[PDB]
Amino acid sequence: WGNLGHETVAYIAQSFVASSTESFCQNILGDDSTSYLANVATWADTYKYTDAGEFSKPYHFIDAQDNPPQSCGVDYDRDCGSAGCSISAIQNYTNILLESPNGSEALNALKFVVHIIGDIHQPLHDENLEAGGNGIDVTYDGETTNLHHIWDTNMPEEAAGGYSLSVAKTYADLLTERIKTGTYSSKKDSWTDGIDIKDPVSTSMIWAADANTYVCSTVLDDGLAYINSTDLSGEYYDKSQPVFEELIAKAGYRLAAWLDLIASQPS
Numbered sequence: 491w492g493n494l495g496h497e498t499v500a501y502i503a504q505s506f507v508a509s510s511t512e513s514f515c516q517n518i519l520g521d522d523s524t525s526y527l528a529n530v531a532t533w534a535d536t537y538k539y540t541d542a543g544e545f546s547k548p549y550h551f552i553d554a555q556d557n558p559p560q561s562c563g564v565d566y567d568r569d570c571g572s573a574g575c576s577i578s579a580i581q582n583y584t585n586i587l588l589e590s591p592n593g594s595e596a597l598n599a600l601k602f603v604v605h606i607i608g609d610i611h612q613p614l615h616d617e618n619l620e621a622g623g624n625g626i627d628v629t630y631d632g633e634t635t636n637l638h639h640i641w642d643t644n645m646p647e648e649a650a651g652g653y654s655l656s657v658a659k660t661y662a663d664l665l666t667e668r669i670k671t672g673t674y675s676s677k678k679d680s681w682t683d684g685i686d687i688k689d690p691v692s693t694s695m696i697w698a699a700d701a702n703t704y705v706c707s708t709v710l711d712d713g714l715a716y717i718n719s720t721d722l723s724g725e726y727y728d729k730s731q732p733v734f735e736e737l738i739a740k741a742g743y744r745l746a747a748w749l750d751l752i753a754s755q756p757s
């Protein structure tokens with residue numbers, strides 16, 4: 491996601507973690523503000539574009555070698571690659587937090603988990619084609635951009651009604667109520683089914699495979715003839731909106747559940 495989407499995921503997670511989880515995270519981050527997770531949600535995207543952080547660029551995605559829109563699927567060995575991927579990073583950084591929660595590595599590990607659980611839920615972060623859709627140029631409300639970027643940024647910002655922090659917080663709030671009592675409330679139990687703190691690869695693969703299904707059902711279903719040539723602020727946005735809203739909600743809820751498990755490590 492872009493900045494607003496990561497902030498939204500983080501605020502959702504803040505609303506669903508247990509209090510002891512909040513304390514566990516605030517202690518690592520050195521921040522007990524109202525925005526303790528949101529303040530670090532976008533960090534990994536800023537860090538990766540430096541000499542120090544470049545090793546972590548692969549950790550934002552898993553380049554599924556499927557054939558969308560006619561065939562979607564993710565396979566960890568096939569798709570992760572030797573430089574690593576979102577799934578391998580969730581394993582590594584989760585295990586750092588389970589083994590070494592107050593060592594020097596914990597702070598970055600936590601910021602990576604907050605960010606990457608968000609990224610796994612953006613379907614094009616679970617797809618190889620054209621570098622996760624970065625190579626597919628499109629027009630969005632008259633602007634030339636690419637398909638990856640509209641899923642990260644243009645469409646979530648349109649749906650939220652802006653780009654600023656207050657806009658992200660309002661959007662998170664909306665999605666938290668959909669989880670608690672509204673349109674996602676009957677599904678949220680399923681969203682945490684299968685979560686296993688002793689198996690971060692399997693756990694995060696549930697989420698990656700889930701998000702990847704939407705590559706075929708929503709991202710690329712229209713075909714590139716249409717996608718390359720039509721302004722995607724029209725019907726493409728209209729049908730995409732409920733999909734990315736539910737995926738952002740899932741990301742925040744799953745992030746909260748995962749943080750609860752890390753903070754509850756037997757100790």
Ligand SMILES: Nc1ccn([C@H]2C[C@H](O)[C@@H](COP(=O)(O)O)O2)c(=O)n1
Binds near residue numbers: 492493609
């Ligand atoms: N050439 C680029 C492309 C993207 N980004 C940043 C801004 C985007 O919002 C973010 C996207 O990261 P991710 O795809 O991991 O969500 O990375 C950047 O600084 N430079």
Ligand SMILES: Nc1ccn([C@H]2C[C@H](O)[C@@H](COP(=O)(O)O)O2)c(=O)n1
Binds near residue numbers: 550616618621624
């Ligand atoms: N195979 C890839 C390559 C990139 N990205 C994401 C991470 C980058 O932040 C963003 C923009 O890519 P780039 O850095 O190539 O401009 O897209 C992705 O999800 N899948």
Ligand SMILES: *[C@@H]1O[C@H](CO)[C@@H](O)[C@H](O)[C@H]1NC(C)=O
Binds near residue numbers: 574579582
């Ligand atoms: C795990 O994270 C540490 C700290 O960033 C890094 O040194 C190491 O290479 C990572 N390992 C894997 C397999 O991602």
Ligand SMILES: *[C@@H]1O[C@H](CO)[C@@H](O)[C@H](O)[C@H]1NC(C)=O
Binds near residue numbers: 626627714715716718
């Ligand atoms: C769509 O654009 C891509 C480049 O992003 C190109 O390879 C492909 O041939 C185009 N397809 C159609 C049907 O226009």
Ligand code: NA
Binds near residue numbers: 677
């Ligand atoms: Na249910």
Ligand SMILES: [Zn+2]
Binds near residue numbers: 491492496608612
């Ligand atoms: Zn992102």
Ligand SMILES: [Zn+2]
Binds near residue numbers: 491492612615638642
């Ligand atoms: Zn992205």
Ligand SMILES: [Zn+2]
Binds near residue numbers: 491605609
């Ligand atoms: Zn990222």
